[PDB]
User: Which sequence fits this backbone?
């Protein structure tokens, strides 16, 4: 799967995690470290870690 979609808005705590809005689409850069994945928003062109329980695969 290339794109994942945000299920809800998320407000990040630090510069590590990425704030995003429901419906944004992301490419996943790295999901190998755990359930928080480094991701690149196609909607905003920003990157950071996102909680994988806040996204679903676009398929
Ligand atoms: Na942030
Ligand atoms: Na954002
Ligand atoms: Na993982
Ligand atoms: Na998920």
Assistant:
């Amino acid at each position: 799967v290339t794109l994942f979609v945000a299920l809800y808005d998320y407000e990040s705590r630090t510069e590590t995690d990425l704030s995003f809005h429901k419906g944004e689409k992301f490419q996943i850069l790295n999901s190998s470290e755990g359930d928080w994945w480094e991701a690149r928003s196609l909607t905003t062109g920003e990157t950071g870690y996102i909680p994988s329980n806040y996204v679903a695969p676009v398929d």
Remarks:
- DSSP finds no helices and five strands in the chain.
